[PDB]
């Protein structure tokens, strides 16, 4: 019928999504960002008070 | 200049001589240090090292 030049096209907008990104355990974890300048001198350790009985 | 005595001085003309001294350079002098990016959370030591280097 119509013999013309062929192309190969990629979908610019459609990405096949694979691998889930659920993080149930990490979202139950608390995040803390201590002051970095003091963290540098404290060997990346900070002490947290425990509630006293 | 030299100085010479007498009247004749025939066949005793001298020449000219000017001496030279050479000034040169030395090697560059450096303060050179390395720091990982974790060391720059507190930069006070870095600035004090710059001052010491001066």
């Amino acid at each position: 019928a119509l013999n013309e030049g062929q192309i190969v096209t990629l979908a610019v907008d459609e990405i096949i999504e694979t691998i889930s990104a659920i993080t149930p355990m990490a979202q139950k974890a608390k995040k803390y960002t201590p002051p970095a300048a003091s963290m540098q001198r404290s060997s990346n350790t900070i002490w947290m008070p425990v509630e006293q009985e | 200049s030299p100085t010479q005595e007498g009247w004749d001085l025939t066949d005793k003309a001298t020449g000219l001589l000017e001496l030279n001294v050479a000034v040169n350079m030395g090697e560059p002098d450096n303060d050179f240090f390395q720091l990982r990016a974790d060391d720059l959370r507190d930069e006070t030591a870095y600035r004090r090292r710059i001052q010491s280097a001066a």
Side-chain angles (χ1 to χ4, degrees), chain A residues 36-41 43-44, chain B residues 38-42 44 48:
Chain A
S38 71
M39 272 295 277
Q40 168 186 331
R41 291 193 179 268
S43 168
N44 304 316
Chain B
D38 47 51
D39 290 345
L40 277 296
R41 293 170 286 167
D42 194 41
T44 73
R48 288 183 215 121

Side-chain angles (χ1 to χ4, degrees), chain A:
Chain A
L2 168 58
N3 314 89
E4 62 156 304
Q6 310 292 297
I7 66 189
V8 175
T9 67
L10 202 78
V12 65
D13 52 8
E14 311 293 2
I15 296 89
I16 308 298
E17 288 87 4
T18 315
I19 297 89
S20 79
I22 70 159
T23 56
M25 311 205 68
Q27 292 184 340
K28 310 287 202 140
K30 178 82 168 304
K31 280 89 183 180
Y32 187 23
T33 311
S38 71
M39 272 295 277
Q40 168 186 331
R41 291 193 179 268
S42 74
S43 168
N44 304 316
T45 298
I46 186 169
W47 288 80
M48 311 215 87
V50 189
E51 57 166 346
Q52 61 183 357
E53 311 196 59

